[PDB]
Amino acid sequence: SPYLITGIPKDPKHPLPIRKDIDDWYLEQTSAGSNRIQLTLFVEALTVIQNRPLNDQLSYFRLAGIHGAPWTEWDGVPGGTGFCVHNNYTFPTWHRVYVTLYEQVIYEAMLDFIKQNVPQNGKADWENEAKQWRLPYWDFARFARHGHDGDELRLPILVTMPMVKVLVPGQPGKQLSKPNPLYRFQMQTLMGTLERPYAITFDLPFDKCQSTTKYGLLENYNADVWADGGQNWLRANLALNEHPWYQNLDGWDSVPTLQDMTFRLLTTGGLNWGEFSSTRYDAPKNWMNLEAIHNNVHNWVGGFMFSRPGRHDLKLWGAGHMSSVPVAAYDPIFWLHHCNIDRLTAIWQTVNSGSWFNDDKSKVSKDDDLRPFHRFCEKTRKVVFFRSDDVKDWRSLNYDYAITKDASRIRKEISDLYGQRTKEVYKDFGEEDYILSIRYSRYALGGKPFQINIFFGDVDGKDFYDARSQNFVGSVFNFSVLSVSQLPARLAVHYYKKQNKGEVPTPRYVVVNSQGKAEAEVKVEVALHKTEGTFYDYRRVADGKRAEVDDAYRA
Amino acid sequence: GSPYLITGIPKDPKHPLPIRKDIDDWYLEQTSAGSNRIQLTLFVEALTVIQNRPLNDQLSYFRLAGIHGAPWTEWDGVPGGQKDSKGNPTGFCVHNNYTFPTWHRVYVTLYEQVIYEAMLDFIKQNVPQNGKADWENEAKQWRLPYWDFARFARGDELRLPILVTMPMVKVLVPGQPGKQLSKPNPLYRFQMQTLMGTLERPYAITSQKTEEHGWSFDLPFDKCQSTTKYGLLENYNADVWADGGQNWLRANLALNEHPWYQNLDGWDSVPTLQDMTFRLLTTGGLNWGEFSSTRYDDAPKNWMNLEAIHNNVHNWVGGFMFSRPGRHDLKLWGAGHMSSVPVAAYDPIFWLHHCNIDRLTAIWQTVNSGSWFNDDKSKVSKDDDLRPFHRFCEKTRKVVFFRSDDVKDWRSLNYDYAITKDASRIRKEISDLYGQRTKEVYKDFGEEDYILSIRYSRYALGGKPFQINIFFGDVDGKDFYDARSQNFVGSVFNFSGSLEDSNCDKCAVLSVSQLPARLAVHYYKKQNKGEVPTPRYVVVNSQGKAEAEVKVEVALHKTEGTFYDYRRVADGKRAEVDDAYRA
Ligand SMILES: [Cu+2]
Ligand SMILES: [Cu+2]
Ligand SMILES: [Cu+2]
Ligand SMILES: [Cu+2]
Q1: Helix spans in A461-520 (H)
Q2: Does B193 touch chain A if contact means CB atoms closer than 8 Å?
Q3: Which ligand is nearest to the CA of B358?
Q4: Helices B306-318 and B272-282, interaxial angle, to 10°?
Q5: Are B213 and B87 in contact (CB under 8 A)?
Q6: Distance of CA B295 to the CA centre of its chain
Q7: Cβ–Cβ under 8 Å, residues A459 and A470
Q8: A251 touches chain B (CB under 8 A)
Q9: Domains in chain A, please, with CATH?
Q10: Which of B28, B40, B159, B182 should one mutate to test binding to chain A, selecting the residue with the greatest count of A CBs within 10 A?
């Protein structure tokens, strides 16, 4: 302390190693053409980091603690209202440094593991693998690879495995199945009981969790179930593949909204940095932003609803860490999600070279200290805080992405990964585009999170939640001066028009809280906009209206 | 060593006949203000010890579970490797025969006894001298809790036990009052150190894929290190199958299966499992052969049987479909150990399920006291050796196998159930626990009853499992699976295994179930001008495809007045599905 964040140190033998897609990396590592060493190193190093004591500021707990709860100091920097930047233009750059911190800590732990565990004849080889390793990213917008015995988005293979097989150093040809540190983070006692001042202690019972969970916290189950609510990865995958309700009807092709949004984000030109970088709002075509997409992914991975009114056999609710800004960083997938958010930023930067804190709005924030992150400044000869300009070129942190390495085919790569399905399905219909604009206050529920669901047509007063809900079009999640997001609406409008003799729909919205109830006093500005031509001159064509729900479902 | 005499927990005169408690009530008591938490600690610690015993210890968890089915080895000196008349591997368990309840009664007792013996060891080893008397007192009161699968958990719904849904559980630290430690919960799952397909010879869990003859399973159980509920799905990386998880919410959903229409607005629901259980316990006049088994030997009202209900619960807890054809974002399939005869006993909930099956047998015996292997068909099986379970015959002074008469009075094994101890109240208790909701919902409609009869062959797919789904109305050709499927009425699961005739001479059978249909008929009539529905059936395999060649006799029957004299009113017909969904 101060812990100097440098990125993995430069070695001439390892020029700008890449952060790989975690699925591609896992498949590579578990093939006979791999020594399986990088997999073993990541698992063993992250296990050590997770098991470190709380007084160790490089423990997993304390590293995750930087983001939000328990709101303590870190690296001598006063804390406590966490350190993470949200709803501001430094959202991408603060998180760029945070991810690099995690990567660097893991690398250092890998080197220690080698020193304590690897025989002499293997040390050079194991060190060599550690120096080439970079933190993989979870490509949340790319169709998963599978046997096809359709295509869908998925959580990483590794995140869905409670156990993982790794090498046993010193015993050639021997492998052992061990608990997988990417599956969850678990402490030895409930997090609400940790020694002061680190206790996690909220309208979700995170104090009653020993393990991080995805969708595992539901009301009206015994509280001891919450100690480890499990990883409902199939449910998370379902949420990640959110799309309009009509697409589940026979005869229609589906397009995951997350992929459509990500394709739009990467291919739409002309945004300034303030528009791209954040939900912050002090041109609705420009409201598709990195942070809003990131917010929905948090929601879809973790779940935010603890309850639902009424009677339901099929229960699609359930809450978990990733939906909650104070505790999301405890879930190991947090870091892989943010690794991809960093990749998306790098891609956008590559195809928008001039647009860096350029506009009058974001310019104010450019020189913000990115607390609590320290580095040694070459220009002033002293320890300072990171600033956004320090990480404009992510390569200065000694990592890269394949997609930005060979950027000569970047637009082709973007289309191949994120645009094929959208184009395939859109091309069946007329050359017009529709988008939804959404503007809200993140503070509208006193700071509490909520979800804004939009519908075209009649709203089921007892089912206004998800893609299973009649006439659902899409959602915007308040992960928590206004905030904005954008949704694709082209295909949902087409369907509505087919049922309603060509009429444009009124966007109807419901604001849903963590109890699954509709909030009547949260203002949301929603509008539908149309342009001629396909997205790959928008005009407002319908104003939003709040939908009513059943009395028992009202907050 | 051998023989291991199965006696039940030894008699302690301080506590003459302790009760096997409802596992949720017991857990709630053990964690409530006022409780010492000693029994919970003992069960967790003892079961953990048993689970960690080596494969060559026949009292290890693995070897006890191994008695039921795979890997089909010897136990207590009784040889394994049995093959049925078609060459299929067969284990010791009895299915589709009238000794189904009595074989399993002894099996559950074995488990309980082994756990109790491990509790005494734990106390002698870990508990300080000044606390040994108190801990021994609790161990001697403990009996294996039952999972009441048909009781609303504390709207109302059926649920897996609280304890089974907890990956971790807090237990006492013996030498330190007030102190607890969270430990992995041995009731959540059973996990070995390697994939079960790679265990030391001869214990590996392997299918007949590289065997000389027979069929046993095709789900990738050889690729599991842990037992799983709904965790095995096709088109995911095989490393996910090492531990597919406990999808307990999905299991709860299956356990609450009811007709499709009940999810529409304005309708009250009744869980079919509870309605079936209430019918099973209250319908008079069945003989032992009718009650005890799915086995049919040559009146549909008497086709509601213990084994069929048990079969459906196996399916609902574990899942049996590995895949589904076509495009589906919401994935309701997924398979696991409890659906599969060869490996179900590895899942710790198996024993709690069978504990309740034993309790249901005891309840039924209590209110049908003159019906014990009483009919010509079942009397033939009364004296079968319940291999591999040994006991001492006092009369001949030799070790013999258990036989059904030895366990007619379960109290001879030194346990009881609250519901059979206070027998004067038994019918009121059955109503309070299993009948209140059925009666409240039925009362809104006409005074008449409808039931579906189902007769099938367990061996229709060469031993493979399948599920028979019944519908009233048009069947969705891409969705013919469960309560989410349009017009679904109910299901019958073929908990399939070998022919279990290994000892028969070479030179020398149908199954039945019954479904409630009253409420579904009411809804169908409401949508079709009062028309009586033709039951439509689809036979579904593990790949989620319809088997057109599996023959099923389905009929709808009606009586005047409520069940709490049936006449056939419609015959069933097979429904076709989409071409891509056809086997
Ligand atoms: Cu953040
Ligand atoms: Cu985030
Ligand atoms: Cu059995
Ligand atoms: Cu069974």
Answers
A1: 490-499
A2: yes
A3: 4
A4: 160
A5: yes
A6: 17
A7: yes
A8: no
A9: 1-419 (1.10.1280.10), 420-555 (2.60.310.20)
A10: B182
